[PDB]
Amino acid sequence: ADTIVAVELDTYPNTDIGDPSYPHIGIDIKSVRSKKTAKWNMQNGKVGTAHIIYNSVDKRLSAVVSYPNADSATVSYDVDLDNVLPEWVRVGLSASTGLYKETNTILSWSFTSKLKSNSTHETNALHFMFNQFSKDQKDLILQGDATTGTDGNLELTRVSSNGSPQGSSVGRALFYAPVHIWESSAVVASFEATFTFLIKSPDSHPADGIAFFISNIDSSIPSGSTGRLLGLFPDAN
Amino acid sequence: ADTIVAVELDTYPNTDIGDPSYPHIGIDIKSVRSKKTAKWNMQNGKVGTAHIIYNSVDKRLSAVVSYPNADSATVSYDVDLDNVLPEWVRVGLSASTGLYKETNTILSWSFTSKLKSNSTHETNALHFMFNQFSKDQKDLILQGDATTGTDGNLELTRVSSNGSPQGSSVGRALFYAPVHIWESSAVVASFEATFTFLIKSPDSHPADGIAFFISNIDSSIPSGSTGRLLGLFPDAN
Amino acid sequence: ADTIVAVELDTYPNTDIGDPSYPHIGIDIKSVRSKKTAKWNMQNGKVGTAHIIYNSVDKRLSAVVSYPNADSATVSYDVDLDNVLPEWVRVGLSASTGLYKETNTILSWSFTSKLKSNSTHETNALHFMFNQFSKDQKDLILQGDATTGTDGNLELTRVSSNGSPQGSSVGRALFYAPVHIWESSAVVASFEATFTFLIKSPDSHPADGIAFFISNIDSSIPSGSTGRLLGLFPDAN
Amino acid sequence: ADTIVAVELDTYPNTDIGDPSYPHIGIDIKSVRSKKTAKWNMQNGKVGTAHIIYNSVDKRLSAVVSYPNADSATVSYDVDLDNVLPEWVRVGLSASTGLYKETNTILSWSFTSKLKSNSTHETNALHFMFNQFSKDQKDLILQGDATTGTDGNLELTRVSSNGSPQGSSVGRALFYAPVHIWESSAVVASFEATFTFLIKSPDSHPADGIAFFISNIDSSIPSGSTGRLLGLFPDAN
Numbered sequence: 045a046d047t048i049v050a051v052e053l054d055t056y057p058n059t060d061i062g063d064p065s066y067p068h069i070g071i072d073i074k075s076v077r078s079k080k081t082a083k084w085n086m087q088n089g090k091v092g093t094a095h096i097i098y099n100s101v102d103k104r105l106s107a108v109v110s111y112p113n114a115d116s117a118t119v120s121y122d123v124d125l126d127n128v129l130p131e132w133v134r135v136g137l138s139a140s141t142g143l144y145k146e147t148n149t150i151l152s153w154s155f156t157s158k159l160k161s162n163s164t165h166e167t168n169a170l171h172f173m174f175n176q177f178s179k180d181q182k183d184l185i186l187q188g189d190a191t192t193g194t195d196g197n198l199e200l201t202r203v204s205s206n207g208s209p210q211g212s213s214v215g216r217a218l219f220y221a222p223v224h225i226w227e228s229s230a231v232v233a234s235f236e237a238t239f240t241f242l243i244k245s246p247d248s249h250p251a252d253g254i255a256f257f258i259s260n261i262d263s264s265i266p267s268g269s270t271g272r273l274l275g276l277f278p279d280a281n
Numbered sequence: 282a283d284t285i286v287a288v289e290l291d292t293y294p295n296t297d298i299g300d301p302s303y304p305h306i307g308i309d310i311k312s313v314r315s316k317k318t319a320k321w322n323m324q325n326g327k328v329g330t331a332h333i334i335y336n337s338v339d340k341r342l343s344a345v346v347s348y349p350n351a352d353s354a355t356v357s358y359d360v361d362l363d364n365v366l367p368e369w370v371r372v373g374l375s376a377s378t379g380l381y382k383e384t385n386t387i388l389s390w391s392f393t394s395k396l397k398s399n400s401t402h403e404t405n406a407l408h409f410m411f412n413q414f415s416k417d418q419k420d421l422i423l424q425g426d427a428t429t430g431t432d433g434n435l436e437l438t439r440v441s442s443n444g445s446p447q448g449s450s451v452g453r454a455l456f457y458a459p460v461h462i463w464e465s466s467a468v469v470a471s472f473e474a475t476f477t478f479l480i481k482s483p484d485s486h487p488a489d490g491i492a493f494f495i496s497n498i499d500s501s502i503p504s505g506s507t508g509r510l511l512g513l514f515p516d517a518n
Numbered sequence: 519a520d521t522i523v524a525v526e527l528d529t530y531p532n533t534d535i536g537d538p539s540y541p542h543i544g545i546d547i548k549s550v551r552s553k554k555t556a557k558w559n560m561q562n563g564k565v566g567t568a569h570i571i572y573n574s575v576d577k578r579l580s581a582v583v584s585y586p587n588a589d590s591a592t593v594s595y596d597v598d599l600d601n602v603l604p605e606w607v608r609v610g611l612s613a614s615t616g617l618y619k620e621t622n623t624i625l626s627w628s629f630t631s632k633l634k635s636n637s638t639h640e641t642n643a644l645h646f647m648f649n650q651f652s653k654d655q656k657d658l659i660l661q662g663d664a665t666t667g668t669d670g671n672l673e674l675t676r677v678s679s680n681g682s683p684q685g686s687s688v689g690r691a692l693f694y695a696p697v698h699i700w701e702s703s704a705v706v707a708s709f710e711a712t713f714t715f716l717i718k719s720p721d722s723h724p725a726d727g728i729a730f731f732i733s734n735i736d737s738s739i740p741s742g743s744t745g746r747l748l749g750l751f752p753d754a755n
Numbered sequence: 756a757d758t759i760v761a762v763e764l765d766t767y768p769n770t771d772i773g774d775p776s777y778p779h780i781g782i783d784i785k786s787v788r789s790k791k792t793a794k795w796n797m798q799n800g801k802v803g804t805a806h807i808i809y810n811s812v813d814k815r816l817s818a819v820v821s822y823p824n825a826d827s828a829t830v831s832y833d834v835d836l837d838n839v840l841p842e843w844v845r846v847g848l849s850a851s852t853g854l855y856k857e858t859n860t861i862l863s864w865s866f867t868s869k870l871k872s873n874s875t876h877e878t879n880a881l882h883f884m885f886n887q888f889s890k891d892q893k894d895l896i897l898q899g900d901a902t903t904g905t906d907g908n909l910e911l912t913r914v915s916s917n918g919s920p921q922g923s924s925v926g927r928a929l930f931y932a933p934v935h936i937w938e939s940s941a942v943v944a945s946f947e948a949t950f951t952f953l954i955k956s957p958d959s960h961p962a963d964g965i966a967f968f969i970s971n972i973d974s975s976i977p978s979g980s981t982g983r984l985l986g987l988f989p990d991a992n
């Protein structure tokens with residue numbers, strides 16, 4: 045199975061697989077059963093921002109999810125990623141709907157990587173930033189039902205013309221260039237990603253969530269991973 | 282064939298195709314016969330730095346090659362890339378040798394692309410920076426005799442165990458991800474590239490030179506482009 | 519007197535001192551009489567963005583001004599800044615009103631400069647970004663009627679409580695740290711600036727205009743420099 | 756007196772006040788007695804690099820010191836700077852000597868701070884980078900014995916014309932512009948500092964050390980702060 049590390053903004057509580065009793069954010073290290081979660085007072089219809097950060101010095105993966113004129117949800121977890129992931133990988137966004145549905149619209153997404161070597165003045169880096177997505181976004185690998193072009197937006201899951209969310213949908217978007225997330229001769233290794241999203245749904249129960257993941261270069265949507273599996277995992281183990 | 286826009290650091294005057302009677306810097310737009318050139322005091326054996334800059338406000342492509350504590354060659358040329366290049370491209374470095382030879386070593390490469398829109402805050406950007414190339418640089422498409430790893434450098438053309446450069450070689454290095462070089466809805470489109478090189482030669486006259494180029498995504502070393510054609514053009518028209 | 523290089527967004531045509539008969543943008547080199555201008559379809563009450571760039575290779579200062587979903591104004595002038603300004607300067611914004619008035623609101627502002635000497639891999643740089651101004655901007659030198667914190671914006675010229683602008687006002691804001699605009703061993707110097715502004719007036723004839731400027735460390739508002747002189751020049755010669 | 760938060764590179768073990776019996780990297784918070792430390796195998800003579808990192812999500816100040824192909828010391832400590840420093844501060848470097856001396860040469864320095872807000876797309880930032888120090892560095896407030904220009908480096912304490920370092924010397928360097936280290940409603944606040952240094956003593960006894968410090972804007976060298984106090988504190992309490 046693919047090797048995956050995610051930060052999930054989980055909107056539907058699936059109590060049978062470990063989800064707490066409310067919408068929340070969590071750190072996923074190779075399984076959908078989060079290794080750490082925090083309550084998140086989601087706000088249907090309002091644009092929000094996610095901030096993920098990690099540095100090899102204190103070895104902690106941290107996320108913050110907020111809405112304007114409202115409080116933020118924070119989560120942090122100690123993890124030596126150079127002990128869980130391959131040297132090179134691909135980074136991306138994933139999302140889904142099961143029985144219940146929502147829009148998993150992405151307004152912007154930026155990411156930065158930096159490997160600073162032992163030898164002075166020898167850093168290597170990658171930085172991209174999309175504040176507008178085109179119809180044919182030739183630098184993004186779109187998987188599942190993901191599309192770009194709708195008002196310069198990136199729609200991870202399926203949507204009807206009328207603007208209605210669909211169920212049992214799954215879609216992901218991966219940046220085209222393989223990233224060198226870690227390296228042995230690197231003194232400091234770090235990365236950061238930011239995206240603004242807009243989850244909006246007609247139900248009284250939106251499902252299922254959006255997630256930012258780091259995977260292997262050849263990763264693909266697993267079979268039947270809609271709904272509770274966020275298009276990331278093959279099973280809820 | 283492929284569309285090419287390049288900045289050539291020509292070490293050998295092929296006066297039969299327009300080359301001036303001395304090693305020069307030139308701006309090639311769809312042809313090996315430069316639109317504008319400038320004398321360059323090719324200083325064999327040492328490390329030089331090149332800087333390429335372009336912005337759509339004043340539509341001027343500019344270059345500057347300089348050696349430490351010495352003179353700088355410079356060239357500019359007004360060109361509206363929108364008219365000459367496809368919206369999406371790949372960028373990269375090329376180099377070749379012929380009857381005569383030289384080592385075409387790259388010690389670091391940088392690039393930045395930006396698309397600022399009419400809409401406030403909307404800006405799309407890409408930036409990569411290599412200060413050390415590994416033996417398996419997975420984010421670089423190595424074409425020809427080009428290889429990475431040696432002293433952490435990128436060798437564009439074939440060199441021997443001792444260090445001696447071989448004639449009639451052709452290598453290329455294209456960054457893996459496609460670049461959105463322009464967009465109609467952008468108020469400002471720009472790019473800057475920088476790279477340090479080391480050209481050495483046992484010959485009384487080295488050849489053929491290094492080049493930075495913007496080409497269509499599916500480009501490759503054309504057939505018979507050794508020597509004077511710098512691995513970029515099919516013929517010499 | 520002070521040395522001033524500026525890009526002016528002139529809203530009131532004072533034809534007597536050499537002004538087009540419509541709102542314009544222009545390059546001001548040590549004088550209020552522009553060396554080059556461009557017609558500006560100034561929109562009342564709309565938030566606009568001004569982008570200014572400059573590099574020592576092509577030696578050309580350019581500026582674009584645009585409103586979303588509409589046309590753009592571009593202007594360029596060839597000038598060697600090292601033959602005009604001191605090696606160390608201070609950058610800033612300036613605005614004024616006279617017998618006629620308008621609000622000169624700055625919503626955001628960012629700047630970047632780069633000095634790259636002949637010594638390979640050596641670069642000095644400065645960059646700031648303000649996306650909201652607080653009532654206590656300790657890193658800005660405010661002059662004249664200029665104030666910050668007002669709704670998170672920077673008010674260059676005096677306004678009222680209900681909003682209404684006052685005439686015969688002049689204000690300026692400069693970044694605290696002195697900028698090293700050029701030097702001896704420089705291979706390439708360049709700066710880029712961006713600011714979003716809001717201009718609205720009760721009278722169907724606004725005035726006078728906003729301007730981005732570079733000046734010597736010790737620069738203050740000239741005497742009687744309201745109106746047509748945009749708080750930058752001592753006289754109209 | 757002034758409020759200090761510093762990361763010290765302590766070359767001399769003053770056990771009588773807390774220094775471990777070996778050189779070390781330590782994290783000081785309003786006191787010369789480090790809250791945390793980590794053994795450091797200082798390497799008299801060769802160039803090193805320190806990298807400080809901090810963010811408000813995990814409220815952890817971390818640092819790494821390394822030399823090429825050698826042991827890198829690391830230190831981290833959980834601390835909420837927002838509950839210790841003013842919103843506006845000044846960042847700088849500091850070094851000192853006493854009965855025993857050393858060279859406290861800074862060859863380069865870079866800093867970056869970002870204030871991300873709950874209100875989306877409203878970030879503020881300051882970033883400077885010095886790769887070559889000038890004889891008249893106007894953007895640096897030089898205090899004590901600090902001087903620039905010597906071979907393009909920054910000398911924090913006194914060295915003779917021949918190069919021999921002088922005891923009982925103390926100097927500082929602070930960036931000219933105040934830094935907004937935190938605002939009451941920022942969702943994320945983070946900074947990163949990097950510098951390369953050369954410390955060498957023509958005898959087997961170096962002292963006293965170099966330190967990156969954050970203080971109130973009006974900070975000035977405390978009296979008798981040489982030697983063991985590193986030019987930061989008025990006493991060893």
Ligand SMILES: O=[N+]([O-])c1ccc(O[C@H]2O[C@H](CO)[C@@H](O)[C@H](O)[C@@H]2O)cc1
Pocket residue numbers: 056058141142143144145251252270271272273
């Ligand atoms: O009413 N219920 O008790 C109840 C309804 C649906 C349910 O699961 C379905 O819908 C969820 C939300 O869309 C997904 O997480 C699941 O993967 C599956 O698609 C489970 C319980």
Ligand SMILES: O=[N+]([O-])c1ccc(O[C@H]2O[C@H](CO)[C@@H](O)[C@H](O)[C@@H]2O)cc1
Pocket residue numbers: 293295378379380381382488489507508509510
């Ligand atoms: O001595 N000569 O008159 C003379 C020598 C070599 C020559 O061309 C050959 O070598 C060049 C440099 O290596 C290449 O650019 C050409 O493509 C070809 O491989 C032409 C004339």
Ligand SMILES: O=[N+]([O-])c1ccc(O[C@H]2O[C@H](CO)[C@@H](O)[C@H](O)[C@@H]2O)cc1
Pocket residue numbers: 530532615616617618619725726744745746747
């Ligand atoms: O319409 N007019 O006949 C007319 C009215 C006023 C005028 O000059 C005044 O107002 C201008 C606009 O504020 C400023 O540029 C001048 O500095 C001065 O303050 C010139 C012509």
Ligand SMILES: O=[N+]([O-])c1ccc(O[C@H]2O[C@H](CO)[C@@H](O)[C@H](O)[C@@H]2O)cc1
Pocket residue numbers: 767769852853854855856962963981982983984
């Ligand atoms: O002989 N010794 O073992 C010995 C020599 C000097 C000494 O203290 C002095 O020198 C230190 C190093 O410069 C400073 O840290 C102190 O502040 C003081 O100025 C203590 C013991």
Ligand SMILES: [Ca+2]
Pocket residue numbers: 054055056057058063252253272
């Ligand atoms: Ca769930």
Ligand SMILES: [Ca+2]
Pocket residue numbers: 291292293294295300489509
């Ligand atoms: Ca040639």
Ligand SMILES: [Ca+2]
Pocket residue numbers: 528529530531532537726746
């Ligand atoms: Ca006017």
Ligand SMILES: [Ca+2]
Pocket residue numbers: 765766767768769774963964983
């Ligand atoms: Ca000590």
Ligand SMILES: [Mn+2]
Pocket residue numbers: 052054063064070076078
């Ligand atoms: Mn969950």
Ligand SMILES: [Mn+2]
Pocket residue numbers: 289291300301305307315
């Ligand atoms: Mn040529």
Ligand SMILES: [Mn+2]
Pocket residue numbers: 526528537538542544552
């Ligand atoms: Mn004018």
Ligand SMILES: [Mn+2]
Pocket residue numbers: 763765774775779781789
């Ligand atoms: Mn200590």
